[PDB]
Ligand binder design. Structure first.
Ligand SMILES: CCCCCCCC(=O)c1c(O)cc(O)cc1CC(=O)OCC
Lengths: 231, 234
């Protein structure tokens, strides 16, 4: 009902439409990947993880009843879920037939201009990408899935039962939508385990980039990292 | 007889395995590990192959002249700062890359595939490094000196750093005295040409332990955890 529509509203307002792209730096050619990753790839990596914070935030608040959660609760769910959301929305938004990563701002890059920036991670992104595109998830269901991933418990919640009351309401609307158009639905959900795997890949890379320390993370990345660390 | 080298190599051999007293009671040159994942046994066994890597490097570091006579806060710092860089090196030389056998300080022998689940892709790099090592065929005395200079070096925090700098020089004199009694400089330069391939195994090592601290099947022993914690510049 209104939930299905209020989620597709917030969703399409967080990504670029078919019309609103910008190829203003796209070259399907990359000159010799000299040595390995230089500071140019590291700071680009940080500026493209920076270019999804504001987007995933407004996308979160324009979802029914997200703002009605405590100031501290909204912060932790968003911090702990950022990486996965960033990934999810990027993979589904991309093109793995030609190798095109399309970002939530509207800019498009070829996988080779990312390779030095992101590391092995990106392939597991493409591998999950087509695996999503083979499922051909429809926009309303994807607007719901994006929410479902964010609307999930992070250790420390003040009102975990209230977060739980919203998820089963969102998950029921996907089950009801997929039934309005159950093994398909389980094949839908079964991607989040591969997602919670790809996140760890993301952290595996950032550990070695703060280590390497060509360029240091933006401060708020520094935060999310430290705060999502179990140690 | 160059008695620093005579009194030094003693510590080395007495900290390494002697052919006859290796351990074959666990070796399987073949094993089918479900690649991609690894259970607590592989991890706690990996952890108990590194907890003991510190006590052996411990019972190899006491026998370093002027090291037991360093402020206990200093001795702990160099052992922790070099532990991982030391572990990879000693493993590579006594290992057998052309057989498929990692021979540890405690005389234990395993097959690459038995480490596959426990260790992961990292260990392949180790083997790849042993190969690069053995092709140079570095002799026993010169190696005994190198592992020390990886330990006896300027780290961040030293209380009495000028002392550590005098011991560094004291180790180099006995190596330079030995490099002249062999050719009676060159090999030293060829060797350093793969020290980046050593600092690489360090970084990969940290990342491996990072991933299993993420995984937290078994919690790391606090001693290694501490080495980890303070080896981070953040
Ligand atoms: C699973 C244990 C490691 C096996 C080797 C895979 C290559 C690697 O070193 C690595 C990583 O471990 C995590 C990452 O996010 C990215 C990379 C690749 C890398 O550094 O870019 C090129 C040098």
């Amino acid at each position: 009902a209104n939930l299905l529509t209020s989620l597709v509203r917030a969703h399409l307002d967080s990504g670029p439409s078919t019309a609103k792209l910008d190829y203003s730096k796209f070259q399907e050619l990359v000159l010799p990947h000299f040595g390995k990753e230089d500071a140019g790839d590291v700071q680009q990596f940080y500026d493209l993880l920076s270019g999804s914070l504001e987007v995933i935030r407004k996308w979160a608040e324009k979802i029914p009843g997200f703002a009605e959660l405590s100031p501290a609760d909204q912060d932790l769910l968003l911090e702990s879920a950022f990486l996965e959301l960033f990934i999810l929305r990027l993979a589904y938004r991309s093109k793995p037939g030609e190798g095109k990563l399309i970002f939530c701002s509207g800019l498009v890059l070829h996988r080779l201009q990312c390779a030095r920036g992101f590391g092995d991670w990106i392939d597991s992104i493409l591998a999950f990408s087509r695996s999503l595109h083979s499922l051909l998830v429809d926009v309303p269901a994807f607007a719901c899935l994006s929410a479902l991933v964010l609307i999930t418990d992070r250790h420390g919640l003040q009102e975990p039962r209230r977060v739980e009351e919203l998820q089963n309401r969102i998950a029921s609307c996907l089950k009801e939508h997929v039934a309005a158009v159950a093994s398909c639905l389980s094949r839908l959900l079964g991607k989040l385990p591969e997602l919670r795997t790809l996140c760890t890949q993301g952290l595996q890379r950032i550990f070695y980039l703060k280590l390497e320390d060509l360029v240091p993370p933006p401060p708020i990345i520094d935060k999310i990292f430290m705060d999502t660390l179990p140690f």
